[PDB]
RNA sequence: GAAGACAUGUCAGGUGGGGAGUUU
RNA sequence: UUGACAUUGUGAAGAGACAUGUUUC
RNA sequence: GUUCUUUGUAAAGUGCCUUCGAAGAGUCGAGUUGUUUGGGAAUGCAGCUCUAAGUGGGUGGUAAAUUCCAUCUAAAGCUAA
RNA sequence: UUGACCUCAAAUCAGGUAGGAGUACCCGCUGAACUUAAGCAUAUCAAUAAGCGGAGGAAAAGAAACCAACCGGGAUUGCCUUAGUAACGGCGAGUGAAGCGGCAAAAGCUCAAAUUUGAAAUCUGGUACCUUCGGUGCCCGAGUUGUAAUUUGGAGAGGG
């Protein structure tokens, strides 16, 4: 699509005496990790998605806390590849919306409201307990007796 | 972006968040071989500032190297000399473990040039480092003015000659009066200062 | 024996002394005789001892009764008195 | 006291090539001049005052003009380097006399050089193999030969003694003040 | 201002000090808004290290002097121990 | 299966003609 | 051969000391 | 020098106002041990332990506390003579 | 049930590189003794002899977390000088350079750290052509865990 769009823009500029503004303003999901982080702290992003399977967890441990500090809707979504397929990449580990058409505003608002009740509310309480209290089946059976 | 979050967080090595990750990763590396290739750098912030670029021609390798003093390679520690030279257990191996790891990975990666390395973990019996290497055979590196300089043969086995960041530190290559004995080469300086200059017209 | 001096760079102790006997020799010979004949306070010669590499002026001889404007970093007690008696002024420079 | 209790014989070097090295340097200079035919083979250097008071009395040539000096001279550091003017960003300017002398030197150098247009048609150059020769370093005059005698009876030697004494007891004086 | 003589508290030749422009390299120490925010975020995420926890406990229970000595023993540099104790006290006060 | 925060790199104390230098 | 320092995690009671969750055997 | 294009209607520079200015962490540094230097109450290098902040940090050849002052910005890299 | 992401394997896969010799010079590791102190262990020999690893016509170093305390010097390296001085050393044998000054030669700089987000604009490889140390059109792949442009503190950047 980029090739056709570039050809159309070049034609409209060279022969159409346009000013490169003929093409409509685009709408796409912002996905760059550095780009997404920079978009945050400016309160421009409307929604943020986080992949939980990031092997270098340090890359994304701070993102939920930073989003909570900035009060931006953030969601942890299973699978980094699913985000990649959504963005025409192998993996992205992050996804965020910046500009959305008015038609999808209501659905976006409902999704943001649901996400806030899913993750944002639990932020204040999830930070004060420790997981990983699981044991093997054999050990559990032996100790239960 | 995430540059400062990664860098500052890595500095809090004593934090509970980093303690669990270190405990998991040291065991994970122990379950692996002494030398193995890391698919992607575990510390992008550290590697990125060391000159690493996420493109074809850059390779990340992980190596495990033992720690402690170096035992003299003699039978029963007998140095067969003056009493002062009989010390064996206290030999300190004046080359840092990072340099040894870089040399070992370069030997295993002779076709790649050791660019730099950074610490990633430690253990009571072993130490862990991550080495960034550049392939001069790749046309991308050769065609890139920012990295084609390493393609020159003068850079062959940089880690072996102590031309790396850690190697230069071990050589004491720094400006100022504190590094006079090694400002411009310890052996070269010793040879120059011990030379008996005699011009045609003796002064 | 005595107190030690770590990193005793010699630049600190550059204080070459000039005797009053050789003080008058700094003026060029082309004008030394004229100044000795035209001895007066109106056009007294100026001898910048620092330009000649002399740090402290010391009195050993007896300069003639000629007013000479002497500039130096240091001067001895007797040297300044002798210069003033000769009619000169001991200026200080750095 | 002779330091010859080592294998010094293995490190003895005799400068037999003194004449040969001189010839090579002269030949190398001519070769570069042929390569550097349009230019004077060197970059103009600034006027500098030395540290180490034993030598501060004598003016010395510097590594390159400061950024402030180049800006005051009416050009830019990048253009200055291509024109043949040495630039030193590390050197600071905290002396009006030296800065003015360097600015005047830069103006004279600019007014004395001819820059051929990049579009060719450059006339005969007739280079000069030394830019420093055309702008020799001159020691500023410290004072005139003769001056009218004036005095105040301050006993300059007494002034030196007072200055020496004051610096010694200043610390003790300040403590005694309280 | 130099006195103009070879000795004294201000010995040296009198010159018109131009006071050159301030070198930017001196500004490396100066903090930045982004760095401050990132450091605060990382500090709140990580919390206090075990030695910092012991230092704050010692400050609360036995005063700063013993805490300062412990910090010097740990950090080695006494000058940095003062800053460590100051930041620990600031953290303690932040609780209330 | 046994065992387990115990065993298992750096300093310090002990023993050490098993081994090296030197004196008589 | 012995002591100390990291490898040394996670669990109750008694012993206590703080704070409004932490430390010792 | 000559000849084929007009390179581009693309890049770079300078002046003033305004808001910023990110600059390298198992690193600096300290204790101990070994080696080394003319480096001396410890010049440099190395094993173990502790382990830092950003108007901060290094140096300022005598250890330590207090308060100023002078110069640079380490833990990244290339480069002929 | 099907297709993806991450890791790890097999390829006599397509395109590549490494060993080794030489080693006077260089860059590091490792490393003694004879001798000397008329004995000898600190020490000297020596940060040398031997051994090991790494390249080139030079190598290294190189644009200061430097030197100075000055009316400031201003990449690195070499010669004279400093200077057989400070200093070190059962203060004994003996060891021992640096700042300033004169000359030899002169060159600068660039990576991370910025959201291009109204457009991954980057690049390896395969294919057809061509003016073949490469360029063009097309197609896979690398790449958002960051490939293009700008900036490196001397400065520099968003706006007017």
From Swiss-Prot, chain B:
Molecular function in Gene Ontology: RNA binding; structural constituent of ribosome
Alphabetized InterPro entries for the sequence: Rbsml_eL15_core_dom_sf (IPR024794), Ribosomal_eL15 (IPR000439), Ribosomal_eL15_CS (IPR020925), Ribosomal_uL23/eL15/eS24_sf (IPR012678)
Location relative to the cell: Cytoplasm
One Pfam family this sequence matches: Ribosomal_L15e
Main location: cytoplasm
Biased composition (Basic residues): 168-184
Gene3D superfamilies, per the entry: Ribosomal protein l15e (3.40.1120.10)
Alphabetic keyword roster: Cytoplasm, Ribonucleoprotein, Ribosomal protein
SMART domains: Ribosomal_L15e
Subunit structure: Component of the large ribosomal subunit (LSU). Mature yeast ribosomes consist of a small (40S) and a large (60S) subunit. The 40S small subunit contains 1 molecule of ribosomal RNA (18S rRNA) and 33 different proteins (encoded by 57 genes). The large 60S subunit contains 3 rRNA molecules (25S, 5.8S and 5S rRNA) and 46 different proteins (encoded by 81 genes).
Function: Component of the ribosome, a large ribonucleoprotein complex responsible for the synthesis of proteins in the cell. The small ribosomal subunit (SSU) binds messenger RNAs (mRNAs) and translates the encoded message by selecting cognate aminoacyl-transfer RNA (tRNA) molecules. The large subunit (LSU) contains the ribosomal catalytic site termed the peptidyl transferase center (PTC), which catalyzes the formation of peptide bonds, thereby polymerizing the amino acids delivered by tRNAs into a polypeptide chain.
Family statement drawn from the similarity comment of this UniProt entry: Belongs to the eukaryotic ribosomal protein eL15 family.
Swiss-Prot record, chain C:
Subunit-structure text: Component of the large ribosomal subunit (LSU). Mature yeast ribosomes consist of a small (40S) and a large (60S) subunit. The 40S small subunit contains 1 molecule of ribosomal RNA (18S rRNA) and 33 different proteins (encoded by 57 genes). The large 60S subunit contains 3 rRNA molecules (25S, 5.8S and 5S rRNA) and 46 different proteins (encoded by 81 genes).
Entry keyword annotation includes Chaperone: no
Compartments it resides in: Cytoplasm
Superkingdom: Eukaryota
Ubl conjugation among keywords: yes
Gene field: RPL28
Positions spanned in the full protein: 56 to 149 of 149
Primary role: Component of the ribosome, a large ribonucleoprotein complex responsible for the synthesis of proteins in the cell. The small ribosomal subunit (SSU) binds messenger RNAs (mRNAs) and translates the encoded message by selecting cognate aminoacyl-transfer RNA (tRNA) molecules. The large subunit (LSU) contains the ribosomal catalytic site termed the peptidyl transferase center (PTC), which catalyzes the formation of peptide bonds, thereby polymerizing the amino acids delivered by tRNAs into a polypeptide chain.
This protein's name: Large ribosomal subunit protein uL15
Glycyl lysine isopeptide (Lys-Gly) (interchain with G-Cter in ubiquitin) cross-link, chain position(s): 41
Alphabetized UniProt keyword annotations: Cytoplasm, Isopeptide bond, Ribonucleoprotein, Ribosomal protein, Ubl conjugation
Family, as annotated: Belongs to the universal ribosomal protein uL15 family.
Chief place of localization: cytoplasm
Curated annotation (Swiss-Prot), chain D:
Chief place where the protein resides: cytoplasm
Cell location: Cytoplasm
Gene Ontology CC terms: cytosol; cytosolic large ribosomal subunit
PROSITE patterns the record matches: RIBOSOMAL_L13E
Any GO MF annotation of the entry: RNA binding
Domain of life: Eukaryota
Modified residues (Phosphothreonine): 134, 142
Any single biological process term in GO: cytoplasmic translation
Keywords for this protein: Cytoplasm, Phosphoprotein, Ribonucleoprotein, Ribosomal protein
Other notes: Present with 133000 molecules/cell in log phase SD medium. There are 2 genes for eL13 in yeast.
Role description: Component of the ribosome, a large ribonucleoprotein complex responsible for the synthesis of proteins in the cell. The small ribosomal subunit (SSU) binds messenger RNAs (mRNAs) and translates the encoded message by selecting cognate aminoacyl-transfer RNA (tRNA) molecules. The large subunit (LSU) contains the ribosomal catalytic site termed the peptidyl transferase center (PTC), which catalyzes the formation of peptide bonds, thereby polymerizing the amino acids delivered by tRNAs into a polypeptide chain.
Subunit organization: Component of the large ribosomal subunit (LSU). Mature yeast ribosomes consist of a small (40S) and a large (60S) subunit. The 40S small subunit contains 1 molecule of ribosomal RNA (18S rRNA) and 33 different proteins (encoded by 57 genes). The large 60S subunit contains 3 rRNA molecules (25S, 5.8S and 5S rRNA) and 46 different proteins (encoded by 81 genes).
Assigned protein family: Belongs to the eukaryotic ribosomal protein eL13 family.
Encoding gene (name): RPL13A
Curated annotation (Swiss-Prot), chain E:
Record keywords: Acetylation, Cytoplasm, Ribonucleoprotein, Ribosomal protein
Signal peptide limits: none
PROSITE patterns: RIBOSOMAL_L36E
Entry GO terms, CC: cytosol; cytosolic large ribosomal subunit
Pfam families associated with the record: Ribosomal_L36e (PF01158)
Mod. after translation: N-terminally acetylated by acetyltransferase NatA.
PANTHER family found in the cross-reference section: 60S RIBOSOMAL PROTEIN L36 (PTHR10114)
Function: Component of the ribosome, a large ribonucleoprotein complex responsible for the synthesis of proteins in the cell. The small ribosomal subunit (SSU) binds messenger RNAs (mRNAs) and translates the encoded message by selecting cognate aminoacyl-transfer RNA (tRNA) molecules. The large subunit (LSU) contains the ribosomal catalytic site termed the peptidyl transferase center (PTC), which catalyzes the formation of peptide bonds, thereby polymerizing the amino acids delivered by tRNAs into a polypeptide chain.
Oligomer and partners: Component of the large ribosomal subunit (LSU). Mature yeast ribosomes consist of a small (40S) and a large (60S) subunit. The 40S small subunit contains 1 molecule of ribosomal RNA (18S rRNA) and 33 different proteins (encoded by 57 genes). The large 60S subunit contains 3 rRNA molecules (25S, 5.8S and 5S rRNA) and 46 different proteins (encoded by 81 genes).
Additional information: Present with 31600 molecules/cell in log phase SD medium.
Name of the protein described by the UniProt record: Large ribosomal subunit protein eL36A
Gene: RPL36A
